[PDB]
RNA sequence: AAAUUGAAGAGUUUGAUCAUGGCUCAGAUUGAACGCUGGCGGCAGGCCUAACACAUGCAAGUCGAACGGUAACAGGAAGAAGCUUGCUUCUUUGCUGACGAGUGGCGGACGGGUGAGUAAUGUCUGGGAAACUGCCUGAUGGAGGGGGAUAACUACUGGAAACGGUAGCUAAUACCGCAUAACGUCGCAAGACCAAAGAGGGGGACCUUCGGGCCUCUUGCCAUCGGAUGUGCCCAGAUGGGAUUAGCUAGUAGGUGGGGUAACGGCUCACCUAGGCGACGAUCCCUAGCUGGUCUGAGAGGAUGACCAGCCACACUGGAACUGAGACACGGUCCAGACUCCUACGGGAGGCAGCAGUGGGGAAUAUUGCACAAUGGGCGCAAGCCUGAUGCAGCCAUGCCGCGUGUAUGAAGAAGGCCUUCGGGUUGUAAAGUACUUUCAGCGGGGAGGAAGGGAGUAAAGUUAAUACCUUUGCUCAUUGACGUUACCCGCAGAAGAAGCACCGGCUAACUCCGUGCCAGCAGCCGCGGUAAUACGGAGGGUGCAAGCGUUAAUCGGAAUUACUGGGCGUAAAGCGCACGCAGGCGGUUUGUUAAGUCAGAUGUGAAAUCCCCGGGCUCAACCUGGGAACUGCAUCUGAUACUGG
């Protein structure tokens, strides 16, 4: 049927801020505002604005998790939502997490607007935060409004462009939006800010600069249009202020979103490969006629409504009963009870118009990061990069019985969050898990004991070792004899053992048939090799797969009737035993190269920690945005390093790990493993 | 009660239950009068008690409290005991 | 639900002409009959009792263009009918429209018969049918559509009808391209190279 | 005339043979699941597991022609007219259509779901006596005259809500007396006693209490005797396994008497007697809904009880009664219990094994759809309302069925692949090319049948008093379809949108090369692989089936391998160590009698569907359907007396 949707009018916004910055608090107020106006969960709401002049815009609000461990969650909302409203604490100012979250959005070119909050908290200055933002984020922020008063004195804010010191009533959060004169003491500051805003608006449009040059007092509406043009172009970081607790400033940022933050139509259209075989860039426009395309995200569950799947409609208009092919899975599934959420309650909808976000009940094949395209498999959508895990800890089911539940539970968790990943250790069969952050692993285990009722203790991952000989041991003698009633089997062997340089042999083992002459009939050469190979895997010193061992057979004896392949195989094992003992082997740990990026001011902290973990550095890279360091920190020593690293770098660093080479273990470490 | 007619039938059943209980005890007490006279052994008292209750059981049987077979059998074996007395 | 692969591999496997080709040319010139298909078609290994029964069954199925499920239903129908199972089975296979259209000669082979019948170009008693395996009752009239009257392939098959031996129980009028089903054959008109006895004990294992 | 015209074997013990004996295979089938693949349509089927927990929406309402009444809409009108070229009659009334809530009647005990319990208190088969039965039906008669109350409503008041409480008023086909009293009940008779309701349509004369009475039509009520239908009760036979379950029973078995039930009955109580069941299996334990049927089998039989139909039992668990013609009641009540929810923390609410759906479990089973158009049901005089029954649609190759994926021509046989005794063979008329065709899919248009009936008008007949109203039969007209963009038909364009799976050592249809080298692996059985592997992996070639093909699970068959049909025991498994002997099984020979077994005839049953035969209709087929046969089993009656029994 008819879309019945005021296209362009509706907006998609995302709230992002540092931990404990008030994001959830202001979002709660936002919903209250829109609800009374009519009369990362998706929350749609028709917002008409503070003065309500604007025709009720269907604003969609999707808050983001400030915590670093949940970067992916913020990332998902960021791409899905064309506009983002950053939140910055007044007292704290820009903080590490806020800086971090800003750059991913810059990568996606998503237009952004920021709202300073917690002005009521004593010891805060909006202008200081503005200065902090421009220095930290390197983006000029024109102050949309100028906060009047501070801490207890704080009573409201004066719009810079409109020049009205709006004073909201104390009786209710948003009943009165009365516009008043700028306070006398603040007008002087307001004056300079107004001129500054006028010049900035003018350059963005360029045409406006011409009128500004002539000195014409530019009409407020024209400059406002220019402001939105730059917002779509993604340069000026518009900033407004208010106190969510004081019920002031939240409504202001909402209106700014409507008249500046771009609409889905405004944002550039998405692209991808029409067919899997060729790149075929199509750049499907945001048109209902264009075949329906959407991306699934944040799959969830409800015990009485079933699975909940969030999809972003970019183009087309899916209808109930329409099969929809999931490009990544190459299979199509039918949409049943499509349902959107109005925050306060859930309302059923037969179909979803383009530009809106809802939920598809009972979509089994729909999972996170799924391109829900049309059955004809039109252009697939680009796939959102996923960051690798930084901290890995081994989780063990409390009881053998729990194992079954444990495995199934973790599997479902991976579906909601791609970054969370679990795998079983090849040796010792340990369920090693890895997560984006320490707190993330913490939350995972917590919900596991609650939702899935599975308690599992967490312990450090055990490490496997190689164990190899040090000094060449030659002329080792091994003789096998089974001379007993019935059938005796005799097979003597003499070999040599020499350590192999790691680079010399990728395999790490060799068997040159040096045997001068037919000292061995030749039928037993494979058998001798097989015996050593079994022993090679089974470490005599401490049960580990021996590597970098070079042995060549040269002498051997056999009994005419008792010559047997098995005899030589066992005899070979015997020779291995004595040779290994006299060569006094040394266990090898998985020394791995590690690359760490960090801010320049914290270079010393990083170097100390790397050194402390018995890791010898090999290089320093003075990259513009911080120094890049490299070291071969022992894997066994490196556990929990991610969390430790953050504290020393104010949570502004990261590291990529790549195994390098198995090296000799220090006496203390080696003995510990032996015992 | 989830059905509107179910609620109505509940109310009417309680009212009819109360009305029927009163009538049934009112009849049943007259059968007790004649039985007590029987063991007292006065035939004249028994006949007086019996012809007080005799219209009552028939009236109740006709109106729908009991079955006319039940009314008949009550009055039938009552006269049998009266005639055995005298 | 049909056969689309090479036609004369079938004729090769049972080693006899199966009439799959139109017959405008000699089957020997078109293909080497005495060899079996494939790289081992030089060798003629000793075929067992089960083998000869299976070859007989597959020979009948490939003459008439009928698959195994269809053919098994015909056998059960043949066994249910009073009489003798062997010629009852053959009698059903004759009453199919493909055979009757082909045998009356409006189609050069069963495949033209299949197109003609399945492309709504065959009427029975004036009623359009497009089912290949529709049984033909005695005293039924099968005629070409007026639209299909002006096609080259139908008239081309009429000459090949004369080129081969005419069926006695089908009366044709090529002047108006029609035919009549007087009654079913009695197994004395049909070719004796088909040993129907083997069919019964194949399906009655 | 036709109604089972029906039975197959093979591999493997040995150096070889015969036998015995197990294991395995070739078939059919499924509520199937998984793997690979997938064009269409028809019909059917689709939580087998957790009788596990349930969000949400719906699944039983209807009657104004029973009654009070007017909350709501429209109509109607007193009147300053809310008002002015009176557009409008905004204060009023049940006056009218109609109707929220209420009283009352009927329905809710049907329809739908599930198989937990239940080894017989159920089911099947055949009988029986001591019963009831709303609605529907036949008949015979009544239907007279009064009384009090209570909702709703009004006022007050409590509570968050659920929902009440106090007082006052008002009806009825609501409730209660009195009259009536017979072919009714009690009694043996004499006698005694028992009921009811009005409402609606229409109208001539008359009388007005100017409300009406009155007249007739319809319908409803009461009594009694029937019919039908439904249900309650009784008996005999049959309907699993275990003796490594041998004794069980005290209202227990029976009698008298009282009570109780619609009805017989230890159904219940008091007393009396000491009985009752059990080796033909009582009692106890495990399992299980039963049947027509379904699968298989030549048959006997074995397994089985999903869909469809009959019966039974349950409705969160346990128990109970009430109302009622019918319930100890799925969407009623009360109590207790487990669990969950709402709350203002005072208390309240709930029961998807209805339909759809969610979670959970699972190898595994679907839409929070459309319409009451058809059939059926409830209410109503009807119109109509309600109907998650049902009719349809959606999803799923889950089965069966049909079709298509093209059709001819086409050579030294192109290219490429493969084998090669390098000569050639093979893929292979297969491809390309030539000509042809357009089924199904797509696009456009046209267009059956499921539709019967109901409504308004009119004519005729009944009918009365009658022209009236009402009914019966036609006649005229305007309409009633969810499916539905229906099946179907026509037009269009072009080979264009459409083939995969398994196997190739033998059993068993179908063979070579390369890799590999007792490794990797394969394998239903035998077994294969340690340098020519037709058995592994790949590739060419072939074979089988085909929108499917394989694997796994499960049933029967083959298995005469529990042998009733239809097996064995000297040595292959198997004769008790021997004997006596109760129960039981069997029994020489003649006559008479009986007629229990046995046999013959007849009668009544053996539901329909299914299976089978002869037909009929979807274009064929599956599918649907008429008749028949069959269900030879049970029971009764009559008869025969050779054999068995008495
Ligand atoms: C080379 C090996 N192969 C792997 O590690 C396989 C196993 C799936 N994963 C990977 O290569 C890839 N990373 C993974 O998938 C996950 C997740 C991850 C993806 N990128 C990351 C970057 C940073 C941190 C990360 O994690 C937060 C990741 N992160 C682990 O697994 C960690 C770290 C690690 C060990 N190696 C690596 C090689 C590259 C990158 C990371 C590692 N693991 C232990 O902390 C640990 C301690 S003791 C132990 N593991 C036992 C199991 N034995 C050994 O490590 C011996 N050894 C040499 C190996 O196992
Ligand atoms: N004084 C003051 N406190 C605030 C304001 N906004 C938020 N807060 C406080 O910040 C704390 C965290 O708020 P929250 O929305 O949950 O931030 P989040 O953890 O990142 O999601 C809350 O306890 C609020 O009381 C404000 O405008 N003024
Ligand atoms: Mg939050
Ligand atoms: Mg802080
Ligand atoms: Mg088929
Ligand atoms: Mg079930
Ligand atoms: Mg059961
Ligand atoms: Mg009454
Ligand atoms: Mg009276
Ligand atoms: Mg009266
Ligand atoms: Mg007694
Ligand atoms: Mg059971
Ligand atoms: Mg048999
Ligand atoms: Mg009662
Ligand atoms: Mg009920
Ligand atoms: Mg229910
Ligand atoms: Mg259900
Ligand atoms: Mg599951
Ligand atoms: Mg309803
Ligand atoms: Mg048998
Ligand atoms: Mg034997
Ligand atoms: Mg022996
Ligand atoms: Mg023996
Ligand atoms: Mg002996
Ligand atoms: Mg004798
Ligand atoms: Mg007899
Ligand atoms: Mg029958």
What residues have CB less than 8 Å from A7, skipping those under 6 apart?
A: A265, A355
Best residue among A72, A387, A388, A392 to mutate for probing ligand 1's pocket (most ligand atoms within 8 Å of CB) is: A392
| Domain encompassing residue B50 | 2-86
What residues have CB less than 8 Å from A110, skipping those under 6 apart?
A: A78, A79, A81, A82, A83, A84, A234, A267
Cα A492 → chain centroid = 60
How many angstroms separate the CA atoms of C67 and C98, rounded? 14
Residue A613: both structure tokens together: 């973990």
Residues near ion ligand 3 (Cβ under 5 Å) = A 24
Ligand 2 neighbourhood includes A173 CB (under 6 angstroms): no
CB A495 within 8 A of CB A553: yes
Please tell us whether the domain made up of C7-93+190-203 is placed in CATH 1.10.1050.10: yes
Best residue among A659, A661, A665, A669 to mutate for probing ligand 1's pocket (most ligand atoms within 8 Å of CB) is: A659
Q: Quick check: do C7-93+190-203 and C94-181 share a fold?
A: no
How many angstroms separate the CA atoms of A480 and A573, rounded? 10
CB A22 within 8 A of CB A320: no
Q: Estimate in Å the CA C162 to C1' D609 gap, whole number.
A: 54
Q: Estimate in Å the CA A48 to C1' D55 gap, whole number.
A: 33
- Cβ of C76: how many Cβ atoms within 10 Å? 12
- Distance (angstroms) between ligand 10 centre and the Cα of B29 equals 26
CB A341 within 8 A of CB A392: no
Closest-CA residue, ligand 2 atom 25, reads: A245
Closest-CA residue, ligand 2 atom 16, reads: A24
CB C21 within 8 A of CB C30: yes
Which nucleotides along chain D are within 7 A of a protein C-beta?
2, 5-8, 26-27, 39, 54-55, 59-62, 101-108, 131-133, 175-178, 184-187, 192-196, 222-224, 258-263, 322-325, 329, 331-333, 350-351, 357-359, 367-368, 394-395, 401-411, 413, 418-419, 425-430, 435-440, 489-491, 499, 507-512, 540-547, 549, 612-614, 619-621
How many C-alpha atoms does A647 have within 13 Å on its Cβ side? 6
Ligand 1 neighbourhood includes A461 CB (under 6 angstroms): yes
What residues have CB less than 8 Å from A212, skipping those under 6 apart?
A: A198, A199, A202, A218
What residues have CB less than 8 Å from A321, skipping those under 6 apart?
A: A334, A335
Beta strand A432-435 with A421-422 is antiparallel
Chains contacting B (3+ CB pairs below 8 angstroms) = none
Q: Estimate in Å the CA A99 to C1' D295 gap, whole number.
A: 74
- Distance (angstroms) between ligand 6 centre and the Cα of A579 equals 69
Q: Is A437 left (phi over 0), alpha (psi -120 to 50) or beta?
A: beta
How many angstroms separate the CA atoms of C170 and C161, rounded? 12
CA dihedral defined by A188, A189, A191, A192, rounded to 10 degrees?
120
How many angstroms separate the CA atoms of A455 and A461, rounded? 18
Beta strand C122-124 with C127-129 is antiparallel
- Ligand 2 atom nearest the C-alpha of A66 is 20
Beta strand A549-558 with A490-499 is antiparallel
Ligand 1 neighbourhood includes A659 CB (under 6 angstroms): yes
- Distance (angstroms) between ligand 16 centre and the Cα of B1 equals 12
- Distance (angstroms) between ligand 2 centre and the Cα of A405 equals 38
Q: Is the CB of B44 under 7 A from strand D?
A: no
How many angstroms separate the CA atoms of A218 and B82, rounded? 122
How many angstroms separate the CA atoms of B71 and B51, rounded? 14
Method: cryo-EM
CB < 7 A to strand D: residues 117-136, chain C: 117-121, 127-135
- Distance (angstroms) between ligand 23 centre and the Cα of A140 equals 108
Residue C193: both structure tokens together: 């190279």
CB B57 within 8 A of CB B71: yes
Locate all alpha helices (DSSP H) within A503-564, ordered by sequence.
525-537
CB A577 within 8 A of CB A540: yes
- Distance (angstroms) between ligand 25 centre and the Cα of A116 equals 122
What is chain A's percent helix, strand, coil content, to nearest 5?
A: 30, 25, 45
Best residue among A387, A389, A427, A587 to mutate for probing ligand 1's pocket (most ligand atoms within 8 Å of CB) is: A389
Would the CA dihedral through B7, B9, B10, B14 be positive or negative?
positive
Beta bridge partners of A422: A433
How many angstroms separate the CA atoms of C136 and A263, rounded? 71
Residue A505: both structure tokens together: 């042999």
Please identify which residue in the block is written with the tokens 């009018």: A9
- Distance (angstroms) between ligand 21 centre and the Cα of A76 equals 77
Q: Is the CB of B23 under 7 A from strand D?
A: yes
Closest-CA residue, ligand 2 atom 11, reads: A22
How many angstroms separate the CA atoms of A652 and A18, rounded? 13
Q: Which CATH class is domain C94-181?
A: alpha beta
Closest-CA residue, ligand 1 atom 7, reads: A425
Using alpha carbons, list the distances in angstroms from residue C110 to A504, A668, C106: 73, 90, 10
Breaks (C-N over 2.5 A) in chain B follow: none
Beta strand A306-315 with A238-241 is unpaired
Q: Which nucleotide is nearest to C153 (CA to C1')?
A: D436
CB < 7 A to strand D: residues 305-324, chain A: 305-307, 320-321
Q: Is the CB of B5 under 7 A from strand D?
A: yes
For D558, which residue's CA is nearest its C1'? Answer: C205
What residues have CB less than 8 Å from B49, skipping those under 6 apart?
A: B30, B33, B34, B36, B37
CB < 7 A to strand D: residues 167-196, chain C: none
Closest-CA residue, ligand 1 atom 38, reads: A658
What DSSP line would sit under C55-98, residue for residue?
HHHHHHHHHHT--HHHHHHHHHHHHHSSS-HHHHHHHHHHHSHH
What DSSP line would sit under A601-667, residue for residue?
GGHHHHHHHHHHTT--EEEEE--SSSEEEEE--BTTT-SSHHHHHHHHTTT--EEEEEEEEEEEPPH
Would the CA dihedral through C124, C126, C127, C130 be positive or negative?
positive
How many angstroms separate the CA atoms of A10 and A59, rounded? 6
- Distance (angstroms) between ligand 26 centre and the Cα of B57 equals 56
- Ligand 1 atom nearest the C-alpha of A434 is 27
How many angstroms separate the CA atoms of A361 and A34, rounded? 26
Domain count within chain B:
1
- Ligand 2 atom nearest the C-alpha of A23 is 15
Measured in angstroms, the resolution is 2.9
Best residue among A15, A23, A25, A243 to mutate for probing ligand 2's pocket (most ligand atoms within 8 Å of CB) is: A25
Sorted by where each begins, the domain ranges of chain C are 7-93+190-203, 94-181
Ligand 1 neighbourhood includes A433 CB (under 6 angstroms): no
- Distance (angstroms) between ligand 25 centre and the Cα of B74 equals 65
How many angstroms separate the CA atoms of C102 and A532, rounded? 77
What residues have CB less than 8 Å from A657, skipping those under 6 apart?
A: A592, A593, A594, A638
Ligand 2 neighbourhood includes A120 CB (under 6 angstroms): yes
Breaks (C-N over 2.5 A) in chain C follow: none
Q: What is the 3-state secondary structure (H, E, C) of A312-337?
A: EEEECCCCCCCEEEECCCCEEEECCC
**Strands across the sheet containing A473-481:** A473-481, A490-499, A549-558, A509-512
What DSSP line would sit under A66-106, residue for residue?
-SGGGHHHHHHHHHHSSEEEEEEETTT-S-HHHHHHHHHHH
How many angstroms separate the CA atoms of A55 and C1, rounded? 63
Residue C15: both structure tokens together: 């080693």
How many angstroms separate the CA atoms of B55 and B44, rounded? 18
Closest-CA residue, ligand 2 atom 7, reads: A22
Q: Estimate in Å the CA A23 to C1' D232 gap, whole number.
A: 75
Radius of gyration of chain A (CA): 34
- Distance (angstroms) between ligand 23 centre and the Cα of A128 equals 110
How many angstroms separate the CA atoms of A105 and A666, rounded? 46
Cα C52 → chain centroid = 21
CB C165 within 8 A of CB C159: no
């Amino acid at each position: 049927s008819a879309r019945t949707t005021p296209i362009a009018r509706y907006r998609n916004i995302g709230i992002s801020a540092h931990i404990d910055a008030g994001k959830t608090t202001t979002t709660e107020r936002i919903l209250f505002y829109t609800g009374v106006n009519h009369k990362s969960a998706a929350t749609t709401a028709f917002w008409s604005g503070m003065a309500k002049q604007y025709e009720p815009h269907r604003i969609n609000i999707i808050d983001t998790p400030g915590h670093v461990d949940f970067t992916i969650e913020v990332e998902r909302s960021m791409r899905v939502l064309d506009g983002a409203v950053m939140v910055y604490c007044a007292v704290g100012g820009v903080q590490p997490q806020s800086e971090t979250v800003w750059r991913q959005a810059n990568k996606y070119k998503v237009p952004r607007i920021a709202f300073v909050n917690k002005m009521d908290r004593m010891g805060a200055n909006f202008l200081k935060v503005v200065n902090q933002i421009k220095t930290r984020l390197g983006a000029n922020p024109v102050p949309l409004q100028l906060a009047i008063g501070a801490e207890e004195h704080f009573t409201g804010v004066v719009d810079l462009v409109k020049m009205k010191a709006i004073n909201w009533n104390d009786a209710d959060q948003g009943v009165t939006f009365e516009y008043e004169d700028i306070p006398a003491d603040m007008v002087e500051l307001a004056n300079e800010w107004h001129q500054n805003l006028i010049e900035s608006a003018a350059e963005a449009s360029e045409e406006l600069m011409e009128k500004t040059l002539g000195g014409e007092e530019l009409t407020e509406a024209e400059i406002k249009g220019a402001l939105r043009q730059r917002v779509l172009d993604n340069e000026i970081i518009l900033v407004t202020c208010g106190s969510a607790f004081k019920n002031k400033g939240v409504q202001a940022m909402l209106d700014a979103v409507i008249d500046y933050l771009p609409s889905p139509v405004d944002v550039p259209a998405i692209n991808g490969i029409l067919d899997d075989g060729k790149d075929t860039p199509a750049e499907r426009h945001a048109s209902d006629d264009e075949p329906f395309s959407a991306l699934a995200f944040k799959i969830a569950t409800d015990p009485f409504v079933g699975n909940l799947t969030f999809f972003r409609v970019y183009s087309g208009v899916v209808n109930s009963g329409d099969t929809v092919l999931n490009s990544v899975k190459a299979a199509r599934e039918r949409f049943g009870r499509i349902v959107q959420m109005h925050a306060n309650k859930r309302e059923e909808i037969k179909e979803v118009r383009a530009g809106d976000i809802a939920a598809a009940i009972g979509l089994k094949d729909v999972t996170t990061g799924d391109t829900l395209c049309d059955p004809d498999a039109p252009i697939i959508l680009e796939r959102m990069e996923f960051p690798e895990p930084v901290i890995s800890i081994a989780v063990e089911p409390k009881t053998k019985a729990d194992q079954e539940k444990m495995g199934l539970a973790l599997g479902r968790l991976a579906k909601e969050d791609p970054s969370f990943r679990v795998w079983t250790d090849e040796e010792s069969n340990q369920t090693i898990i890895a997560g984006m952050g320490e707190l993330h692993l913490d939350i995972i285990v917590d919900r596991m004991k609650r939702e899935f009722n599975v308690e599992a203790n967490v312990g450090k991952p055990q490490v496997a070792y190689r164990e190899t000989i040090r000094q060449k041991v030659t002329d080792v003698e091994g003789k096998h004899a089974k001379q007993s009633g019935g059938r005796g089997q005799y097979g003597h062997v003499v070999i040599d053992m020499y350590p192999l340089e790691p680079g010399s042999n990728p395999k790490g083992y060799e068997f040159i048939n040096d045997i001068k002459g037919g000292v061995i009939p030749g039928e037993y050469i494979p058998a001798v090799d097989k015996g050593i190979q079994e022993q090679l895997k089974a470490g005599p010193l401490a049960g580990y797969p021996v590597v970098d061992m070079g042995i060549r057979l040269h002498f051997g004896s056999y009994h005419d009737v008792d010559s047997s392949e098995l005899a030589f195989k066992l005899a070979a094992s015997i020779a291995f035993k004595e040779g290994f003992k006299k060569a006094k082997p040394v266990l090898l740990e998985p020394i791995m190269k590690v690359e760490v990026e960090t801010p320049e001011e914290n270079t010393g902290d990083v170097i100390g920690d790397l050194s402390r973990r018995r890791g010898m550095l090999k290089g320093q890279e003075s990259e513009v945005t911080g120094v890049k360091i490299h070291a071969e920190v022992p894997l066994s020593e490196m556990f929990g390093y991610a969390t430790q690293l953050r504290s020393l770098t104010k949570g502004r660093a990261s590291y990529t790990m790549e195994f390098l080479k198995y090296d000799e273990a220090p006496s203390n470490v080696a003995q510990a493993v032996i015992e | 009660a989830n059905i509107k007619s179910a609620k109505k039938r509940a109310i009417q059943s309680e009212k009819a239950r109360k009305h029927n209980a009163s009538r049934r005890s009112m009849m049943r007490t007259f059968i007790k009068k004649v039985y007590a006279a029987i063991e007292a052994g006065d035939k004249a008292a028994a006949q007086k008690a019996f012809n007080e209750m005799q219209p009552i059981v028939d009236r109740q049987a006709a109106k729908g409290l009991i079955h006319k077979n039940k009314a008949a059998r009550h009055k039938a074996n009552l006269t049998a005991q009266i005639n055995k007395l005298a | 639900a049909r056969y689309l692969g090479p036609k004369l591999k079938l004729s090769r496997r049972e080693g006899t002409d199966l009439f799959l080709k139109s017959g405008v040319r000699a089957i020997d010139t078109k293909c080497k009959i005495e060899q079996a298909p494939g790289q081992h078609g030089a060798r003629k290994p000793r075929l067992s009792d089960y083998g000869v029964q299976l070859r007989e069954k597959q020979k009948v199925r490939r003459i008439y263009g009928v698959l195994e499920r269809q053919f098994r239903n015909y056998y059960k129908e043949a066994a249910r009918l009073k009489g003798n199972t062997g010629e009852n089975l053959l009698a059903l296979l004759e009453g199919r429209l493909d055979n009757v259209v082909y045998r009356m000669g409006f189609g050069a082979t069963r495949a033209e018969a299949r197109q003609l019948v399945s492309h709504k170009a065959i009427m029975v008693n004036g009623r359009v049918v497009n089912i290949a395996s529709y049984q033909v009752s005695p005293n039924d009239v099968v005629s070409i559509r007026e639209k299909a009257k002006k096609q080259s392939r139908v008239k081309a098959a009429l000459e090949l009808a004369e080129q081969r031996e005419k069926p006695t129980w089908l009366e044709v009028d090529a002047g108006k391209m029609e035919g009549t089903f007087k009654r079913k054959p009695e197994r004395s008109d049909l070719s004796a190279d088909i040993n129907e006895h083997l069919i019964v004990e194949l399906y009655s294992k």
